[PDB]
Design a protein around this nucleic acid. Structure first.
Ligand SMILES: C/C(=C\[C@H](C)CCCCC(=O)O)[C@@H]1O[C@@H]2C=C[C@@H]1OC(=O)\C=C/C=C\C=C\[C@H]1O[C@@H]3C[C@H]1O[C@@H](/C=C/C[C@H]1O[C@H](C[C@H](O)[C@H]1C)[C@@H](O)[C@@H](O)/C=C/CC/C=C/C2)[C@@H]3C
Ligand SMILES: [Zn+2]
Lengths: 115, 195, 883, 96
DNA sequence: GCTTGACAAAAGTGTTAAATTGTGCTATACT
């Protein structure tokens, strides 16, 4: 209740001395883009593209659909198996092997830096 | 003197009806934001409290109009509505300005537009910039006229993107992220790249 | 002098100090003690005053009753140290048919300060008119506090009047009618927010001392007035556009019961000074002609201010007009008011050094100013020490009582200056009352030590000491002479939020085990750990809403088997450009009951200390207003050195152009060498004519002797040159300085001597709060404000520089259209620009063309909100919008 | 966003101009729910008019991925688009 | 290389019980 009672403060107030700057000026926009990240993110997409090349044509597509890298929306095993026309268990089996292939040192060592 | 204002409307296409508003535009929220301050407290622009006074009195007017109330009450509401829009646009230009807690005059759209430190004169003209820095100065009697002494740390953070690329071109760091920490922690291998 | 453990500092005073300096901390105590109405005030006032004095609160009820009487005051809730620790206010509740508790009442410490919410504040006395100068009243701390209570009581009675009418009669009591909210909220609204209530400025004991005693002039108008003699110091006032408005109280100034300042005066009758010192207010001053301090009095017994003009009663001494800070400048009578004012201001800007050496050539106020500041440990009762430890000191008084004193050890001041007390006594030492037991931060043996004594040479040295720059010997770094400790406080809080409750834990989402290597089990940095820029101090975690992560990130999640954690990372890292060791950690939990604002669960604060070597760029200055940065620091090898091989410490160019002068500095430099090497007049067939005015004691003096030359009554030109003649040689008996104060210095680089003799000596310089580590800023990329997308100075750091309107003019003057556009767009307001520039820089591509600055887009929106239909018309594209 | 516009003109904004600008009338003097702290509907900050708070996320959540953009949620009435529009879109108030 | 049926967990969906929220109301007389 004591948290609800608190009323807001004026951004247009002047916390800085002698109107040097209003209070609102010191508010960060944490949602703003981070230049370094948008570049690293872009380099990560490029690096995954190569990693996808090592996998099977169908196997690479399964990884894309399972995580939604292509259309931005993931798909359940049934949905993924529906586009390839196989059981939903078969997609589960195929995916597990992709991860093992992905955890191989040759394919996986390059992506650790991206945490 | 009056003919200028009359001719201006004639020579142009503006309908003088524009001087009386039937609808009032509402500024986007981000320009009148309400964010929770560091420390759990809330902060919000004054425009929200000025719009609130307008939309409250406006709604109450619809109520009175539908209630068939006497004209003293209704007219008293239109007068109150009129003053709320006046405060929203140029608070204080007529009568005492609307003041919040502490008796401070709320910042209307006019004040927000202009001001020495306001968005009109210098807040729009004079803004802060990246890739900058300052520090106290000391004499450099041995410098050439075209030279300047720059603290290594200052020149490092200033050129951070540049040195990051160079020490990645050179197989010192393998990727951009690896180059960022290499500069942030100030590993002694960057200095040679910095010069 | 007149103090028990006072060190031996010979004085050139030709006049006795008839009246001892009053407790220059009384202006704050007397007013608050009169307010609360302590028995000590009643006992002190009744002896020589009205037999029925009324306390401030007692007087408030007297006028208010009948609508309340006999208000109570219980003992303080917690101790000062306990209040500053728990961030609470040092207060004592007060009470007042039905009994009523009015609220916690703040209390004044022995140092004349208040603890309001854990911070040490100081109320500034206001000088208001009761026109003419004498018409100034001067509200004292207790009085202007009472007036704020009047508003609280009066508006409290306005509430009781309304309540009793609506409430049923006989069904209401004082408790039901009294809503003390406007009363308690009136005092809380004063000590905070009030312009007269200020955070105590304490980076050196003198700064805090002058913060108190300082007064406001207004309640032309800035110019000093004849009446200000002996009351307000005209030589002390801010340099900014507040000159005249603010002034510090004079040394001997005493305030009368109302508040009208009184000045000590010794009435002179029949041309003989009468020891009877009486109080003469501004008005009472004109009644009797006032005589000048410096007056020719021959043996036993024997220019005056007119009632309304210039040039009955005699002044109590010189420096009546001068304040404490001003009265500590040796040779004040020689420096211009500008430099003197500058000197006083910079004295309170000094920082406490680890060693704290006392000034070799000083005045008289050092001893009195130090012990009165409150930052030095004084023995209350004569006796002997029982134990002496770095933690505390105990004294076994002959009376039999047993007093102990806990020493402030590495206590952070209000602006990060370390305050460390040093014990100066031993086990069996027998100490007298009022003596000094332990040295404060900027004190040595009881007297203020705001700086160090350095060997100076006044020659221009190859352009490195140009204009106002200074060069130092690397010895000042190797021997930690100008090294000062600086403590920083960081804080983090765990509270309830909109969608979850913050949790301060060690486990951080995406981090290596090395970055967390120095954190403890709870997640707070371990004590004694070294922290670099960016290292984690406290690991806090708060709930994050619907993840909705990026697929490119989820893929790596499954690949490396790192489960995408639930909530976001919120750790407290060290601000950019900072570093040091962790001293202490204060943890305030919720399970441990404690007492935190609603929603807060845990509250921890980390204190980090730094040992700052005197670095090139720092700002040094003397007591005469001379200031300058450190332009360079040569190794002790290549430094102008005397024939002894003794290198000089600092090389100062001749700042004082003709007419500008700055004469006082030259004098203390020569005296500095005199005091450092001693002297002996070698009296043969009498003493030289110049020493006739001198008193015996300064005839012979050993090496390293401290000297005292009170402001107006100090050493004189003739006496100086005489002391210059007498200089004890070093080992081997060679002489290093002549009667002119000059010496043939050897250039430590070429090896050849400097052709002309150079002036050398010892000058007392200070280390000012302006420090390079605190003023160096650099930024490539960083946080941006929310409303305006301009680069915002992150609370960690990385604040961008402002390219003001004037700079734009200079940019337009050059015709560099591209550089200007670059600054006002991609470097600031361009939302998509600054990111694509950083991108282009990393790849090595050309920098793209700037976009639309967000400021302009906001401008159009502001116009539309004002019902102004604006359209950015193209040459042939009609209307356009940003979007 | 060409960065090269020839002219810049003003003029009295008519009631129709204001109505055309707005993305919907703000009907309530409300800001955000004191508990959820989310923007109240029909009031100031109303995502249904000014814009969503999160990128490509409607108020209720039946549409969350970037897959669908330029559409409006048939439940909360929020258009699925970038959160920046929260800074470009205006509302209006019809005066009695 | 793939599918089956088991089984489970997880995700929904319809049905109910708190709780939250909005509105109406209080008759000495009171301007
Ligand atoms: C300008 C002013 C106060 C300023 C904040 C500080 C004075 C600046 C002058 C100067 O330092 O050169 C006036 O203050 C009072 C009422 C009106 C004015 O307020 C004004 O016009 C403006 C502000 C008045 C009170 C503000 C209180 C709070 O703002 C912050 C937190 C709260 O207290 C303030 C702390 C002030 C202590 C200062 O102390 C000085 C040094 C620094 O300037 C500060 C450490 C010391 O030199 C000390 O000896 C001098 C004290 C000034 C005595 C003036 C009393 C009148 C701090 C800035
Ligand atoms: Zn929705």
């Amino acid at each position: 209740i004591q948290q609800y009672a608190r009323e807001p403060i004026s951004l247009d107030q002047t916390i800085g001395d002698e109107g040097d700057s209003q209070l609102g000026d010191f508010i960060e926009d944490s949602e703003a883009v981070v230049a370094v990240d948008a570049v690293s993110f872009t380099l990560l997409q490029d690096q995954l593209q190569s990693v996808l090349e090592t996998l099977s044509e169908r196997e690479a597509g399964v990884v894309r659909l399972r995580f939604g890298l292509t259309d931005g929306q993931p798909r359940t095993l049934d949905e993924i198996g529906q586009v390839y026309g196989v059981t939903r268990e078969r997609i589960r089996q195929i995916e597990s092997k992709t991860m093992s292939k992905l955890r191989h040192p040759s394919r996986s060592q390059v992506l650790r830096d991206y945490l | 003197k009056r003919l200028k204002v009359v001719a201006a409307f004639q020579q142009s296409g503006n309908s003088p009806m524009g001087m009386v508003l039937d609808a009032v535009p509402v500024i986007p929220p981000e320009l009148r934001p309400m964010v929770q301050l560091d420390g759990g407290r809330f902060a919000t622009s004054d425009l929200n409290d000025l719009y609130r006074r307008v939309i409250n009195r406006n709604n109450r007017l619809k109520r009175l109009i539908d209630l068939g109330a006497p004209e003293i009450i209704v007219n008293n509401e239109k007068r109150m509505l009129q003053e709320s829009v006046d405060a929203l646009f140029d608070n204080g230009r007529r009568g005492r300005p609307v003041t919040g807690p502490g008796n401070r005059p709320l910042k209307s759209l006019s004040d927000l537009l202009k001001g020495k430190q306001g968005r009109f004169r210098q807040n729009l003209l004079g803004k802060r910039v990246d890739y900058s820095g300052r520090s106290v100065i000391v004499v450099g009697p041995q410098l050439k006229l075209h030279q300047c002494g720059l603290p290594k740390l200052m020149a490092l953070e200033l050129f951070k993107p540049f040195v990051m690329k160079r020490l990645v071109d050179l197989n010192h760091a393998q990727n951009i992220k690896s180059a960022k920490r290499m500069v942030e922690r100030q590993r002694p291998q960057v200095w040679d790249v910095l010069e | 002098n007149s103090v028990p453990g006072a060190p031996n500092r010979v004085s050139f005073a030709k006049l006795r100090e008839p009246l001892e300096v009053p407790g220059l901390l009384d202006v704050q105590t007397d007013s608050f003690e009169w307010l609360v109405g302590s028995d000590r005030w009643r006992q002190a006032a009744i002896d020589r005053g009205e037999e029925n004095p009324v306390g401030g609160l007692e007087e408030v009820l007297a006028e208010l009753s009948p609508i309340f009487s006999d208000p109570r005051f219980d003992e303080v809730k917690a101790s000062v140290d306990e209040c500053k620790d728990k961030d609470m206010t040092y207060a004592a509740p007060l009470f007042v048919s039905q009994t009523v508790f009015m609220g916690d009442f703040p209390m004044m410490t022995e140092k004349g300060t208040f603890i309001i919410n854990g911070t040490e504040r100081v109320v500034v006395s206001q000088l208001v008119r009761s026109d003419h100068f004498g018409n100034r009243r001067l509200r004292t701390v207790g009085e202007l506090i009472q007036n704020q209570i009047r508003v609280g009581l009066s508006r409290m009675e306005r509430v009781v009047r309304e309540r009793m009418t609506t409430q049923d009669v006989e069904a209401i009591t004082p408790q039901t009618l009294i809503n003390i909210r406007p009363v308690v909220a009136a005092i809380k609204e004063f000590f905070g927010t009030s312009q007269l209530s200020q955070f105590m400025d304490q980076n050196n004991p003198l700064s805090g001392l002058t913060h108190k005693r300082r007064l406001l002039a207004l309640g032309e108008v800035r110019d000093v007035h004849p009446s200000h003699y002996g009351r307000m110091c005209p030589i002390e006032t801010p340099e900014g556009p507040n000159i005249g408005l603010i002034g510090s109280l004079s040394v001997y100034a005493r305030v009368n019961p109302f508040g009208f300042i009184e000045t000590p005066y010794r009435k002179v009758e029949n041309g003989v000074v009468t020891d009877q010192i009486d109080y003469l207010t501004a008005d009472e001053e004109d009644r009797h002609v006032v005589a000048q301090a410096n007056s020719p009095t021959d043996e036993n017994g024997r220019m005056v201010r007119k009632k309304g003009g210039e040039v009955d009663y005699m002044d109590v001494s010189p420096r009546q007009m001068v304040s404490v800070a001003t009265a500590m400048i040796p040779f004040l009578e020689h420096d211009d008011a500008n430099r003197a004012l500058m000197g006083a201001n910079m004295q309170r800007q000094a920082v406490p050094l680890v060693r704290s050496e006392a000034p070799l050539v000083g005045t008289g106020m050092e001893l009195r100013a130090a012990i009165d500041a409150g930052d030095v440990v004084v023995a209350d009762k004569t006796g002997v020490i029982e134990e002496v430890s770095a933690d505390y000191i105990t004294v076994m008084a002959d009376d039999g009582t047993r007093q102990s004193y806990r020493l402030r050890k590495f206590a952070r001041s209000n602006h990060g200056t370390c305050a460390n007390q040093r014990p100066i006594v031993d086990a069996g030492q027998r100490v007298e009352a009022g003596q000094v037991i332990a040295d404060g931060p900027c004190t040595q043996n009881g007297e203020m030590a705001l700086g160090k004594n350095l060997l100076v040479a006044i020659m221009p040295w190859e352009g490195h000491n140009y204009e106002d720059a200074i060069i130092l010997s690397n010895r000042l770094v190797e021997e930690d002479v100008l090294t000062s400790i600086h403590i920083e406080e960081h804080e983090i809080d765990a509270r309830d939020t909109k969608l979850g409750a913050e949790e301060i834990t060690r486990d951080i989402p995406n981090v290596s085990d090395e970055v967390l290597a120095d954190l403890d089990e709870r997640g707070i940095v371990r004590i004694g750990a070294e922290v670099r820029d960016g290292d984690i101090l406290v690991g806090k975690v708060t709930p994050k809403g619907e993840t909705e992560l990026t697929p490119e990130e989820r893929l790596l999640r499954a690949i490396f088997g790192e489960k995408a954690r639930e909530v976001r990372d919120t750790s407290l890292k060290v601000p950019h450009g900072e570093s040091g060791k962790v001293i202490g950690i204060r943890v305030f939990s919720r399970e441990d009951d404690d007492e935190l604002p609603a929603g807060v669960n845990e509250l921890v604060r980390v204190y980090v200390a730094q040992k700052r070597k005197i670095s090139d760029g720092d700002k040094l200055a003397g007591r005469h207003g001379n200031k300058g940065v450190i332009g360079k620091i040569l190794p002790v090898e290549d430094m102008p050195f005397l024939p002894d091989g003794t290198p000089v410490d600092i090389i100062l160019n001749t700042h004082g152009v003709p007419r500008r002068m700055n004469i006082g500095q030259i004098l203390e430099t020569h005296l500095g060498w005199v005091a450092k090497a001693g002297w002996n007049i070698d009296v043969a067939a009498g003493v030289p004519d110049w020493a006739s005015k001198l008193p015996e004691e300064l005839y012979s003096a050993p090496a390293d002797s401290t000297v005292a030359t009170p402001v107006f009554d100090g050493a004189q030109e003739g006496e100086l040159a005489g002391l210059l003649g007498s200089t004890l040689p070093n080992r081997d008996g060679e002489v290093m300085v002549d009667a002119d104060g000059k010496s043939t210095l050897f250039d430590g680089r070429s090896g050849e001597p400097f052709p002309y003799p150079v002036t050398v000596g010892y000058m007392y310089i200070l280390k000012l709060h302006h420090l390079v580590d605190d003023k160096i800023h650099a930024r490539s990329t960083g946080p941006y404000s929310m409303i305006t997308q301009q680069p915002l100075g992150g609370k960690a750091q990385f604040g961008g520089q402002r390219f003001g309107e004037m700079e734009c003019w200079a940019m337009q003057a050059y015709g560099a259209a591209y550089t200007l556009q670059e600054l006002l767009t991609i470097k600031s307001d361009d939302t998509v620009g600054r990111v694509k520039v950083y991108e282009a820089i990393v790849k090595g591509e050309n920098i793209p063309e700037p976009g639309i600055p967000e400021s302009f887009k906001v401008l159009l929106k502001e116009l539309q909100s004002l019902c102004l239909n604006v359209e950015v018309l193209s040459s042939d594209g009609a209307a356009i919008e940003m979007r | 966003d060409v960065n090269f516009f020839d002219e810049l003109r003003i003029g009295l904004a008519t009631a129709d101009d204001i109505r055309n600008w707005s993305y919907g009338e703000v009907k309530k003097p409300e800001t955000i729910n004191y508990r959820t702290l989310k923007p109240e509907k029909d009031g100031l900050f109303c995502e249904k008019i000014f814009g969503p708070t999160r990128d490509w996320e409607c108020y209720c959540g039946k549409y969350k991925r970037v897959r669908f953009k330029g559409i409006i949620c048939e439940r909360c009435g929020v258009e699925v688009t970038r959160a920046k529009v929260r800074r470009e879109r205006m509302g209006h108030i019809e005066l009695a």
